[PDB]
Design an enzyme around this catalytic site. Structure first.
Site, PDB file in Angstrom:
ATOM      1  N   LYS B 283       0.783  -1.213   0.035  1.00  0.00           N
ATOM      2  CA  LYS B 283       0.110  -0.042   0.060  1.00  0.00           C
ATOM      3  C   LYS B 283       0.850   1.268  -0.002  1.00  0.00           C
ATOM      4  O   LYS B 283       1.951   1.147   0.381  1.00  0.00           O
ATOM      5  CB  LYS B 283      -0.875  -0.015   1.185  1.00  0.00           C
ATOM      6  N   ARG B 357     -10.172 -11.876   1.658  1.00  0.00           N
ATOM      7  CA  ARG B 357     -10.691 -13.018   0.956  1.00  0.00           C
ATOM      8  C   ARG B 357     -10.251 -14.039   1.140  1.00  0.00           C
ATOM      9  O   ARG B 357     -10.693 -15.361   1.191  1.00  0.00           O
ATOM     10  CB  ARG B 357     -11.323 -12.646  -0.510  1.00  0.00           C
TER      11      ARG B 357
HETATM   12 NA    NA Z   1      -5.436  -5.840   1.795  1.00  0.00          NA
END
Ligand code: NA
Ligand code: CL
Ligand code: CL
Ligand code: CL
Ligand code: CL
Ligand code: CL
Ligand code: CL
Ligand code: CL
Ligand code: CL
Ligand code: CL
Ligand code: CL
Ligand code: NA
Ligand code: NA
Ligand code: NA
Ligand code: NA
Ligand code: NA
Ligand code: NA
Ligand code: NA
Ligand code: NA
Ligand code: NA
Lengths: 500, 500
Positions: B283, B357
């Site tokens: 990120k 997920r």
């Molecule tokens: Na993530």
């Protein structure tokens, strides 16, 4: 006198017998009530002491407790405001206290209020200096800009504020209040012009505003020069900024002669870019609505004149507002263009978004004809200044140490502070161009300084200083987004001192 | 009962003779005082009417006016709060009114307050439903997270809140208050776990928190599975997320058997990524501190259990908290890795930042063994959900329309709303991979939906729904930055209805 719907009075009467809708008293955190509050408490037979003992008001700066009718008082309400635990407040705490008081009073239906705050001490400030800060904070705190709202707020009931002062201090308080009111009026004009949207506030509109100010103040003379006259004067970089927009540029000249004809004038030069898209060097879209504040430099010249004209200061003052709109178009200035400034120096325009300096440099050359004893330009010039000094302190540069010091001192007194950055000769080579006399931008290093260095090349003939207000001229977001009116308080204080 | 320093009582006595430090009354904007306020005004001989006539309180929602001792009252203070001009309030206005009341009371030195707000009408809400919203807003409004502050705020004096209700409504109000208190307690645990910094709140810490909850609640059984057991179970995508971090992963299993052994359980599956760097798919730095909230899904399973355990609901409930830390390292999962999930489906991990997920899908396979009648996963899964639905509404998807409707209805009642997005079969092809059974990400289109589509491939054996709380689990900036505790109110209300 203040024009925004408030009368400010100074009186030397006893607070405990004063007829008023709301009497405002200060309450210390963990220290005895001051002299005024104690006298009022005694008059009520201890009712205020008895409330405070219950503990709802800790006394932290700006905390409030509102009482209704108390025995033996002529005040309909009594507002207690916390003053903290220190012997003296700083400027920030004094402003916070005043704003908390005003916020409460605004929400009440009382038509007046009396402030019995004379016992408050503020670091380094006597009666006059405290009144300057208090009244300016109150008056500017009343500012409203709602002409584009279909639903307007209810008008305030509060229309009068009385400052209670001992008879020995009342003349100083009155003087401070009068000056603060003029400053606040000037700030309100500056904020209005800054807040207007750019489809309304264009250079021609600013010209008509100057003419309107001369209608109101017979001591002001105004001349507005259009693009034909600018071209006759040889104002090539100013014209280059303006040429991409449908809106014609304006050079607005304000003159006020409050002193004898033998006194050299002070010149204020304001950047009035009524909207800055960047031009061909186009800005990103995010937040570009705040570029309507790119004329706040010129707006602050309006506001400083407005205050000086009200005070009728014995000084000679000239304002030069260089106004243009910076737009992309099929005829706009291109990166790499070379233009001849009115001084004769050629400039390579490497980036069309560094355009404030291009209208300012021609105005600085124009200022030579007035044989000024000081020239100060004010401009929302560089985002680099926000990196350097943030949103609370304006950047200051100049070619004369005494003038720079005078402006710093004025900003300290006004609590509208600036901070000097150096124009060392080593920075100048960043503006070297292989093609022209000067490039209009340096590199990514020292951007606020190299902008000041660029302007300095046009100011060598007089004592000059430069205020970068890119960070201080407006508030970017939130409920309080909008123009601030700075640096009108600094500039007006500078001129007040030059007028002595 | 609420654990955060507040006792909530319901009483049916007359407000005008109730002994209390502060009696709270509602005042309409431009309409007659309600029945309770009028009875109190009459008892004072018109003192409240007389104050209001003076005009300081316009009556807008949440405006306040605080009075001290009034004649013939046993209330030490009377707090007037504006209720606007409408016949009925909406949920937002009711919450705003309640928060304004609480904000005032927090700053007072009164040890208790009595709320005489029964005359307020709220759209679509009877006594029980209003009490649910009011008490939850008050109790959650008392939340404090200050364990890392060296200087802590002064403790509140306020320790007791009494809700006044007519005798015919008092049982419903009491029920609503009891349920709201349990929900607020659960929200407080959720918010604590969410707000903890990630160097403290790692998966092993969450395992110890589960064990501590079982110590407090004898009806709860807890099992914590470490990485060896996960590998024995074949939990390949879960392990792939965890492998780059020094912190070992944990699968935490909570079981509560409040119903007969013949009742199929409801399963809550929570994403507990205690910090999400993105992994190798790193990120950007800006705002990445809020990735400590990437375990808020698991935190909300803790909080929902905490509320259910306090209420002793007659239901069978299972919690599965899939916790890992997502770090870059010399052994971290790489984009392009292919792993075998516990279901046997192979997954191509195209982007290591779509890792929620990957721990959830193995937990969904694990959930099959409980033969559940409903499975709900909760996860801060996609920034795309914030684009779609903002910060105030959670995204909801599922494979069973009745369950989706039950959750929507629970969110409406709770005022903790969700909104369904479709899992149309046409979206599934976005997860096609040339190499593996499934790719872990779709394209830039329909990102919230394709994440739900990915999870749906592991939920075919039972009724399942999926709550994307990326926007609702926390507040990003400002003074109120921090975890919200959502969707504990929605989930607890869902289970309250399933328990009838
Ligand atoms: Na993530
Ligand atoms: Cl004095
Ligand atoms: Cl004009
Ligand atoms: Cl023209
Ligand atoms: Cl700053
Ligand atoms: Cl000064
Ligand atoms: Cl009822
Ligand atoms: Cl553990
Ligand atoms: Cl371990
Ligand atoms: Cl939103
Ligand atoms: Cl429901
Ligand atoms: Na202090
Ligand atoms: Na201060
Ligand atoms: Na520019
Ligand atoms: Na500009
Ligand atoms: Na540079
Ligand atoms: Na209303
Ligand atoms: Na509402
Ligand atoms: Na994540
Ligand atoms: Na796509």
């Amino acid at each position: 006198y203040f024009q925004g719907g408030m009368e400010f009075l100074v009186k030397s009467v006893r607070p405990e017998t004063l007829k008023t809708a709301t009497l405002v008293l200060a309450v210390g955190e963990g220290r005895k009530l001051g002299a005024s509050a104690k006298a009022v408490d005694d008059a009520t037979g201890g009712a205020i002491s008895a409330v405070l003992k219950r503990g709802d008001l800790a006394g932290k700066v700006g905390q409030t407790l509102l009482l209704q009718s108390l025995p033996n008082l002529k005040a309909e309400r009594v507002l207690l405001v916390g003053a903290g635990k220190e012997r003296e407040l700083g400027d920030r705490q004094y402003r916070k206290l005043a704003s908390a008081v005003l916020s409460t009073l605004k929400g009440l239906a009382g038509a007046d209020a009396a402030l019995a705050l004379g016992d408050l001490a503020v670091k380094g400030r006597g009666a006059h200096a405290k009144a300057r800060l208090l009244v300016e904070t109150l008056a500017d705190g009343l500012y409203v800009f709602d002409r584009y709202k279909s639903q307007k707020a209810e008008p305030l009931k509060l229309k009068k504020l009385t400052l209670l002062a001992d008879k020995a201090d009342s003349a100083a308080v009155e003087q401070g209040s009068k000056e603060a009111q003029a400053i606040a009026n000037g700030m309100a004009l500056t904020r209005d012009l800054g807040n207007l949207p750019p489809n309304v506030c264009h250079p021609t509109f600013l010209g008509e505003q100057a003419k309107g100010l001369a209608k109101e103040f017979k001591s002001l003379k105004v001349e507005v020069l259009d693009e034909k006259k600018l071209r006759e004067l040889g104002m090539g970089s100013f014209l280059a900024v303006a040429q991409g927009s449908d809106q014609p540029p304006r050079l607005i000249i304000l003159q006020y002669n409050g002193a004898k004809k033998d006194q050299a004038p002070h010149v204020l030069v304001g950047k009035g870019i009524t909207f800055d898209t960047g031009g061909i060097s186009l800005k990103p879209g995010l937040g570009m609505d705040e570029m309507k504040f790119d004329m706040c430099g010129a707006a602050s010249v309006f506001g400083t004149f407005r205050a000086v004209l009200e005070l009728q200061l014995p000084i000679n003052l000239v304002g030069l507002l260089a106004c243009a709109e910076n737009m992309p178009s099929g005829g706009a200035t291109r990166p790499g263009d070379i233009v001849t400034t009115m001084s004769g120096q050629t400039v390579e325009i490497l980036n069309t978004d560094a355009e404030g300096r291009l209208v300012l440099c021609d105005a600085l050359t124009y200022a030579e004809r007035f044989k000024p004893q000081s020239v100060i330009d004010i401009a929302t010039l560089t985002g680099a200044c926000i990196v350097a000094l943030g949103s609370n302190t304006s950047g200051l540069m100049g070619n004369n140490e005494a003038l720079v010091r005078q402006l710093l001192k004025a900003g300290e007194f006004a609590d509208d502070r600036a901070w000097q950055l150096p124009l060392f000769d080593e920075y100048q080579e960043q503006l070297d161009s292989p093609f022209a006399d000067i490039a209009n931008i340096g590199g990514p290093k020292a951007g606020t300084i190299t902008a000041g260095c660029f302007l300095s090349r046009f100011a060598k003939k007089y004592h000059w200083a430069h205020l970068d207000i890119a960070g201080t001229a407006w508030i970017s977001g939130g409920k309080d987004k909008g123009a601030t009116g700075r640096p009108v308080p600094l500039l007006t204080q500078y001129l007040l001192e030059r007028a002595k």
